[PDB]
Symmetry: D2
Subunit: 124 residues, 4 copies
């Protein structure tokens, strides 16, 4: 599978679908699967942090795909339980020669806020 | 599979192995699999945040398994790339009636620091 | 001194001015001072988090000065050195019966992002 | 004023005292003051992050006052209201050529955890 110009075994396991990236943003979609679920039947937070990580970075190497990106730190807030196909949109807040700052949110089909995250990246 | 007294489809997909929990701590082990890998062949950060989330919470409901736990927010720092079987140890820093604070680290077979995380939980 | 319905001896000390609070958002302002600077001459990041802490909570208790809000945890990103007067604006992302989520940013006179922060809150009621 | 090799006008303003820096750890102390309190009478969390910011960096540039460290991002957890004199102690978790990771905690005279924080740093060299 092609994830924004890169192969990623774990993202292929999660079945996430890359939709867009460019102009400092990126959009990913997470289809529902009983595999990715919580102990309460909700989409596991780990699952959300995974696709969010992917998407967060893609908002950097979408304006510049020749660039290498590595997550330094990432903060996630879980607002409400995720269920059914989700959509992840991220946005790059500031980009430098070495460091880039990003953010994003996960929303359900009903447009409600499932989770929000912000991260720091090392631009290789 | 039994994960500290709970079924979790996503943790079963990741193949993580619960080893211990109690007295405010918990220990999990993540076996190596090519499925859980990075674009650089390293264990994906999302994968680390997943097992860390599991383990972080388990350090609360190990002293009290009758308790329900839900992650509010979680911060993760990635120190060095993870490879080969990893071990995750977490520790509860403060527990209240409503809120609990946790922390943990992931280390490789060589005992080096792969990642570190801290989280906030709602004790149900 | 009046900080959206309460006196905060530390805030009064930072020389910060409350600009708005209500409908899930808030505004505050940090007039430049030399008491408040780093060693690089820039406004100290702690000065930033202090005013950001103050203002993030305000976006919750403006819709209700009847409630109490205590910061649980806060994450702050440092994008650009802060200088001169700064304006701080926050928004509540979600409000529960017990837990509140907020975010915000600090900008300089030139409108450039100085720092951005997110916070979790305990609403005391 | 001497803060491990530099003057910080804001820190000097908080009335904080440098207690140690070297070998990947650091210590600082926050003598109680009324200028530094919340509205609940507790020491303002911003006062905490300010001193925590100061001290986290110190755990890096004590092994080398030759280098510069700039805070990239910081996460702070609030566990217990802070009161009376507080002691701040940090440790460097990892040091790269460009990026440094640190953590730390604030405790009261009774030794109870007031707040814990983690931070990422840019080492300027």
């Amino acid at each position: 599978t092609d994830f924004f110009g890169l192969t990623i075994p774990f993202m292929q396991l999660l079945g996430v679908v890359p939709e867009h990236s460019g102009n400092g943003t990126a959009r990913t979609r997470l289809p529902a699967r009983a595999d990715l679920v919580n102990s309460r039947g909700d989409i596991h937070g780990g699952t959300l942090m995974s696709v969010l990580d992917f998407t967060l970075g893609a908002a950097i190497r979408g304006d510049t795909p020749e660039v290498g990106v590595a997550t330094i730190d990432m903060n996630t807030s879980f607002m409400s339980p995720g269920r059914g196909d989700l959509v992840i949109e991220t946005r790059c807040l500031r980009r430098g020669a070495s460091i880039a700052f990003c953010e994003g949110e996960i929303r359900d089909s009903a447009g409600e806020l499932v989770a929000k995250a912000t991260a720091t990246f090392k631009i290789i």
